[PDB]
Amino acid sequence: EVQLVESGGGLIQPGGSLRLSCAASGFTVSSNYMSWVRQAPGKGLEWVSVIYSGGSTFYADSVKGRFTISRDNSKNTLYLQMNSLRAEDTAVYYCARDLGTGLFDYWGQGTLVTVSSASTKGPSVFPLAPSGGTAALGCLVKDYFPEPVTVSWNSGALTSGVHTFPAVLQSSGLYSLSSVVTVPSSSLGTQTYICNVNHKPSNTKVDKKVEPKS
Amino acid sequence: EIVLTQSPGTLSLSPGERATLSCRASQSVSSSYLAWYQQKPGQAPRLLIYGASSRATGIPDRFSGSGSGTDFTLTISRLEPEDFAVYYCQQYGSSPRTFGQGTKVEIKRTVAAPSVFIFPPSDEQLKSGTASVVCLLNNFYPREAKVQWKVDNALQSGNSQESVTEQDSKDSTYSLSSTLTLSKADYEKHKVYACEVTHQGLSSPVTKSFNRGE
């Protein structure tokens, strides 16, 4: 069973340097073409680098002079050294095996490399109050960094009809997220609705009650 | 850098229907140097077809490939719930290993009009110094939808950010949140704030508006 398990990815400031590792099981790294291929957030796949069985290394123009591919045979690992990082390098990376010199037949699970020049900041939680039949309410979790954020409703008691929107990166460098839910409007005054926001990178938990408005 | 162009960009088909994706190359690649890959959201790619007509190990007999020269075709004979994902074509004949820009295959539900709600900024957020007006489009299809912001019937563009949810698991619907962030002064300088939704499911564009402080 061919299994590629990747690790080492994480948050890092621009200009930094990371070392992505990919451990293999079921085949030899020294005898196979081993490639790194990344996927930008909301974009297709681009082949990053490759190491041949004979030690030959090749890189793309976008990573030439900044990335270095290597393989360790005693522990059958693949290393990708990332230097001079920029926001363009933010992506989910995959180590892959090349069968028949070009076919990426077996992949890994992927590791995330996030390059941002911010600082860790806690979120500010604001309500989105309602106002026939179905009523929509929600929470705006603004100005936090970095991802992720777990948002529940009524400490998990309310799961039907919840839509948590993906966080977008504002121009200020922090993230903004919206968590909305549709409920029976009749229960708006006779039921307490709390959105629970947990942001572990800053260890910030906010329980915000959403009560109707005028 | 032989240019692969996939067609279409997004293919809306229901389970059971026959999917036909196209990959057209700028320069001819030999028939046995085009591969078709599958990728699901949050998952690594998966080699489906090698040599443009041969199936990878494990791949059902509903996936198929054909073509030659510059034109290639990926055929899903009968669609399954599990097949709805992104698909890529890659040429690996020359040295520049290039991918296609992607082709998404998604479940077509009947055109559903978005339930449009609007959320003005709260008093806490207005005390914070900035105001973000939220516009929620709930349970609509397709994903293509236009959201316009009008401050006193004046179209504001370039200061609002959109966020789209993943396709729902049951009804295959979308939810969109458009956040218009503006200063407290610019918020209090006007009265009428409107979100205008232009969608294929709406015979007439729907305007959800509010008046500041009412």
Numbering used by the authors:
A (entry chain H): 1 to 82, 82A, 82B, 82C, 83 to 100, 100A, 101 to 127, 133 to 215
B (entry chain L): 1 to 27, 27A, 28 to 213
Reproduce the article's own wording on this structure:
Antibodies to the receptor binding domain (RBD) on the spike protein are frequently encoded by IGHV3-53/3-66 with a short complementarity-determining region (CDR) H3. IGHV3-53/3-66 antibodies carry germline-encoded features that are critical for RBD binding—an NY motif in CDR H1 and an SGGS motif in CDR H233,49,56. Here, we identify two public clonotypes of IGHV3-53/3-66 RBD antibodies with a 9-residue CDR H3 that pair with different light chains. Distinct sequence motifs on CDR H3 are present in the two public clonotypes that seem to be related to differential light chain pairing.
To experimentally examine the compatibility between CDR H3 and the light chains from clonotype 1 and clonotype 2 antibodies, we focused on antibodies COV107-23 (clonotype 1) and COVD21-C8 (clonotype 2). The heavy-chain sequences of these two antibodies only differ by four amino acids in CDR H3, namely VH residues 96, 98, 99, and 100. Of note, COV107-23 uses IGHJ4, which is seldom observed among clonotype 1 antibodies but highly preferred in clonotype 2 antibodies, to encode the two amino acids at the C-terminus of its CDR H3. Both COV107-23 and COVD21-C8 bind strongly to the SARS-CoV-2 RBD, with dissociation constants (KD) of 1 nM and 4 nM, respectively. However, when their light chains are swapped, their binding affinity to the RBD is weakened substantially to KD > 1 μM. We further determined apo crystal structures of COV107-23 paired with its native light chain and with the light chain from COVD21-C8 to 2.0 Å and 3.3 Å, respectively. The conformations of CDR H3 indeed differ when paired with different light chains, as exemplified by the 3.3 Å displacement of VH G97 near the tip of CDR H3 and different side-chain orientations of VH T98. In addition, a type I′ β-turn is observed at the tip of CDR H3 in COV107-23 when paired with its native light chain but not with the light chain from COVD21-C8. One important finding in this study is that the CDR H3 sequence that supports IGHV3-53/3-66 antibodies binding to RBD is light chain-dependent.
